[PDB]
Design a protein around this ligand. Structure first.
Ligand SMILES: COCCOC[C@H](C)N
Ligand SMILES: [Cl-]
Length: 342
């Protein structure tokens, strides 16, 4: 009687997905969650994770492959692979050549989640919720402090967002861009930021405890739905700002030392079933990478342009690149200064 150990992002599966898989297959699943690519990457680089499946963002998987931490997926054990969208596979192949190691799961953008009524109360009806100006102009963030501001604890995404806002290459390789203008701006914003955290902002948005967050799209749409279901009067929305935003692709991968590989393939093939992954998207408010599943996704999710954005929005999205030791050094040092004080 076998087990399967899965490590996924929090708030990233439907409530019954695992139970349904267990009932079908007789496999027992141990399911654990993270909210940080850095936490997962540290575990993968430090030794064995004790997991059979993990879910990095593809930009992080790109560098993890060169450490040999994953094993290549045997496509013969993944007959439902045919359901994946060829255009999304090509994009993920920029990180995972020939799609050898990674199964695309969900994708979205890093944008602005906000309480509609509170932001308009503070910055007026014409609050610039369509722009990173809302939170990256110090004068706006000084006012939004009154109702609470969170940033993601995600250094690579935050710096790339700030760099793009400043008109630099989002993946600048100029150290001075990080130590100079990006740091200078973030240090002006810091006094007005309540916390840096990549998951507490969901319930804090939903409950009205913060009014603006840098957030991942589906997380914010979940906060909006939780508030609606609580009938608490809180109106949360999400914006892909006009200056552009980072897109990401989260992907399942199999550690090279996975104990229960056959069971891991069974779960991957299960997630590739159109009705399974559409049901997930319906609950987590993220676009999946399964073309066959799209018609089965609820209209509420499929028709939301902050989840399944149209081509003209997609054209303004950017993706992360791998950096060298120097940039990693200067960026991480700068991030520690920005978060200083807790
Ligand atoms: C169906 O294509 C999805 C595209 O994702 C966004 C990229 C950055 N253009
Ligand atoms: Cl529907």
């Amino acid at each position: 009687q076998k087990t399967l150990h899965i490590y996924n992002w929090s708030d990233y599966i439907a409530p019954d997905t695992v139970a349904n898989f267990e009932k079908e297959t007789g496999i027992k699943v141990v399911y654990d969650v993270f909210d940080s690519n850095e936490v997962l990457e540290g575990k993968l680089m430090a030794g064995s994770t004790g997991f059979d499946l993990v879910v990095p963002s593809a930009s992080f998987l790109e560098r993890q492959l060169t450490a040999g931490v994953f094993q290549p997926l045997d496509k013969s054990k993944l007959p439902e692979w045919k359901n994946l969208d060829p255009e999304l596979l090509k994009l993920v192949a920029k990180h995972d050549p020939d799609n050898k190691f990674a199964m695309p799961y969900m994708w979205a953008t890093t944008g602005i989640g906000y309480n509609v009524d509170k932001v308009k109360a503070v910055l007026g009806e014409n609050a610039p919720v369509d722009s990173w100006d809302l939170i990256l102009k110090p004068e706006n963030l000084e006012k939004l402090k009154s109702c609470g501001v969170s940033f993601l604890d995600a250094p690579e995404e935050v710096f790339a967002t700030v760099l793009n806002y400043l008109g630099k290459d989002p993946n600048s390789t100029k150290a001075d861009d990080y130590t100079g203008p990006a740091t200078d701006l973030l240090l002006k914003l810091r006094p007005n930021i309540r916390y840096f955290h990549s998951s507490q902002y969901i319930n804090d948005l939903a409950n009205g405890d913060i009014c603006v967050a840098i957030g991942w799209a589906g997380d914010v749409w979940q906060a909006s739905n939780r508030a609606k279901e609580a009938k608490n009067g809180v109106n949360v929305s999400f914006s892909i700002p006009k200056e552009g935003a980072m897109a990401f692709f989260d992907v399942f991968a199999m550690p090279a030392d996975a104990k229960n590989k056959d069971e891991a393939y069974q779960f991957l093939n299960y997630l590739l079933r159109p009705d399974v992954v559409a049901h997930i998207s319906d609950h987590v408010f993220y676009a999946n990478a399964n073309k066959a599943a799209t018609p089965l996704v609820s209209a509420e999710v499929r028709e939301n342009p902050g989840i399944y954005p149209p081509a003209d929005v997609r054209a303004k999205l950017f993706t992360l690149k791998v950096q060298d030791p120097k940039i990693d050094r200067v960026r991480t040092r700068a991030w520690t200064k920005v978060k200083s004080g807790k």
